[PDB]
Design a protein around this ligand. Structure first.
Ligand SMILES: OC[C@H]1O[C@@H](O)[C@H](O)[C@@H](O)[C@@H]1O
Ligand SMILES: OC[C@H]1O[C@@H](O)[C@H](O)[C@@H](O)[C@@H]1O
Ligand SMILES: OC[C@H]1O[C@@H](O)[C@H](O)[C@@H](O)[C@@H]1O
Ligand SMILES: OC[C@H]1O[C@@H](O)[C@H](O)[C@@H](O)[C@@H]1O
Ligand SMILES: OC[C@H]1O[C@@H](O)[C@H](O)[C@@H](O)[C@@H]1O
Ligand SMILES: OC[C@H]1O[C@@H](O)[C@H](O)[C@@H](O)[C@@H]1O
Ligand SMILES: OC[C@H]1O[C@@H](O)[C@H](O)[C@@H](O)[C@@H]1O
Ligand SMILES: OC[C@H]1O[C@@H](O)[C@H](O)[C@@H](O)[C@@H]1O
Ligand code: NA
Ligand code: NA
Lengths: 340, 340
């Protein structure tokens, strides 16, 4: 499994990027832009406390309240939430279970958050809010299978959640809701290939799921739905390169997909659709730097991509689509990924 | 009340703009882009039938299914929906009531559509889906007040719906949910001024509501929340000009607000935030043409603004942010607005 993303990042409901990482104390720390603009100053790192043994994953509830999910020292799923949109936080609360992966998080069309995690049986399990952005939470329920990666989740353009994970054959497997808001899940399907990273999944500007992963030759690969929210899937296509981290994918403000990955020389590299969305891909270009994590990419409130990655000093470094000079957000981050 | 928008327009879940208008037969007709790109060809006009006595208002359910709301010849609220995302349509069904305005439509954080309409008592009434993108619908419920315009609705950045309408004093009044998904609504509040158009409301890139309306001197005015999802509101500010239609507002792909209105010479005019979102406004610029409706503006799948307006030939004409040459979508549209 290629070197993981070190932070979870979201553009908040007031247009400020907030990042969540694990400190040397194994607590979750957050940093937020002071202003909703490219090159904004930052609040600085503020602790949510806790003791996590996974990558923390933030998600924005449909009412704008941020909610962080992370495995605890007891291997239970824990969570903590803003009590008001972009305001104070709750205490950490357990959702129980015994999980063996980072959580994957998305929200159903009914505003109910769905959290996916590998179990001690190596099956995909999930637990959900029973009301929109509200407790109580459901029971833990199994979707079966045997997965050898952290899971990834994205909603289809018809509101059906779809989960991607590596199988015991190192192929990309996936499973989907057969209707929105449903616990009627499909059987597992193999999209084949051999992946040596966690999969990442995004929705194209024309409403198709597209999955990126590193292959056995350390090139970037991708595969996509050929119709909106539907099969068949394309064959695997190489985007080439030699990458030494997990890839991070993001949509430009004009819908062009752009992928960030660490190269052999430990610099940040990127490759993008040219002209328009679902257009022909560029060749790889360097953004330089020296990074000790996978990059994490998000669009800011000015419609510019922002990239975060840990540096050799273990601080979180930022670069944005002007491109800008590398700047440090400081702090000291660790890779707490449940699967490495 | 300044000349109204003639179509309801949405960017569908597969990145194709679809427009809804009233034909000379008083049926609702729709036209959709063949491709999810600027300057795409169109399907041509296809009838949903019905007999409407209001502007038709389309909304995308959280599962991607389009749903159109319009007053019938019996003055009841009627609706029709796609049975699958971007697929076939249902028959028209009545939601009953007796309404005296165009419908205003938004979705709650729980995926429940909320429809607002003036009653025969000139009070603001509403009816909602009781489950996410699903029937049965609620009873009609009154929010009281006396309104002299079509209502406008937008969600706050904390998930609270907020409705704007002109009062008997010709001032801008508003009312809001005190919590998301709630029928706990606030009292009416006056934002003062004198408006001679329907209000239009948008959410800024930094999570604030901003309202645009024509004033007594036929200038464009605007007023905004000074904090995300919160008061106090600004004082009214003039964006000047002399406009002879309702203004239409839209966010650029980079969050810059842009406003479209008909000028004294019947040409399309526009004015925009410069540099970045919540930045200083341009002066008015012409896009020429000769229009016989207010313009309607939406962002396409390429991140470019598209504007629609009826021409002197009663066809719907299109121009986009390249700017492009005016092109005709043909058809023959009427202004069916319930309040003129
Ligand atoms: O108050 C809202 C919060 O309530 C908690 O009980 C739930 O577990 C959270 O998921 C929710 O966001
Ligand atoms: O029914 C829809 C489903 O069809 C399957 O064949 C595809 O592999 C899934 O990605 C899709 O969600
Ligand atoms: O076409 C725009 C593209 O051009 C490149 O020069 C930039 O570095 C990319 O981030 C961008 O997506
Ligand atoms: O629809 C086909 C296109 O989908 C895009 O999102 C992919 O990145 C392209 O490689 C592909 O040609
Ligand atoms: O099937 C979905 C549709 O069902 C109808 O009964 C409801 O009235 C619509 O609002 C809904 O979109
Ligand atoms: O409580 C929030 C509400 O506060 C009021 O003072 C504002 O006028 C409303 O726009 C806002 O939604
Ligand atoms: O800064 C970009 C702006 O420049 C003007 O020339 C265009 O006509 C506007 O549509 C655009 O928003
Ligand atoms: O926050 C203040 C700013 O809000 C913007 O959305 C308005 O268009 C500006 O006129 C105003 O200066
Ligand atoms: Na994340
Ligand atoms: Na509309």
């Amino acid at each position: 499994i290629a070197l993981s993303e070190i932070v979870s990042v979201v553009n908040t409901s007031d247009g400020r990027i907030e990042v969540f990482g694990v400190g040397t104390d194994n607590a979750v720390w957050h940093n937020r832009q002071t202003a909703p603009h490219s090159g904004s100053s930052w609040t600085g790192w503020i602790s949510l406390n806790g003791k996590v043994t996974s990558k923390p994953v933030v998600y924005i509830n449909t009412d704008g309240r941020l909610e962080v999910f992370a495995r605890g020292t007891d291997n239970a799923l824990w969570h903590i939430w803003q009590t008001a949109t972009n305001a104070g936080w709750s205490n950490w609360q357990s959702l129980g279970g015994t999980i063996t992966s980072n959580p994957a998080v998305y929200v159903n069309t009914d505003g109910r958050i769905d959290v996916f995690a590998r179990g001690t049986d190596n099956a995909l399990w999930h637990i959900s809010q029973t009301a929109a952005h509200s407790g109580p939470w459901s029971s833990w329920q199994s979707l079966n299978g045997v997965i050898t990666s952290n899971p990834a989740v994205h909603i289809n353009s018809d509101g059906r959640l779809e989960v991607f994970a590596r199988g015991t054959d190192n192929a990309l497997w996936h499973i989907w809701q057969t209707a929105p808001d449903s616990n009627q899940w499909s059987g597992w399907d193999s999209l084949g290939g051999v992946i040596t990273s966690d999969p990442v999944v995004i929705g194209t500007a024309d409403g198709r799921l597209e999955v990126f992963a590193r292959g056995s030759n350390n090139a970037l690969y991708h595969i996509w739905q050929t119709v909106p929210h539907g099969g068949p899937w394309s064959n695997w296509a190489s985007l080439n390169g030699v990458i030494t981290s997990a890839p991070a994918v993001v949509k430009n403000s004009d819908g062009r997909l752009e992928v960030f990955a660490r190269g052999t020389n430990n610099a940040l590299y990127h490759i993008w659709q040219t002209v328009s969305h679902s257009g022909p891909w560029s060749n790889w270009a360097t953004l330089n730097g020296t990074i000790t994590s996978a990059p994490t990419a998000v669009e800011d409130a000015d419609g510019r991509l922002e990239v975060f990655a840990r540096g050799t000093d273990n601080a979180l470094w930022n670069i944005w689509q002007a491109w800008s000079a590398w700047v440090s957000l400081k702090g000291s981050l660790i890779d707490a990924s449940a699967i490495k």
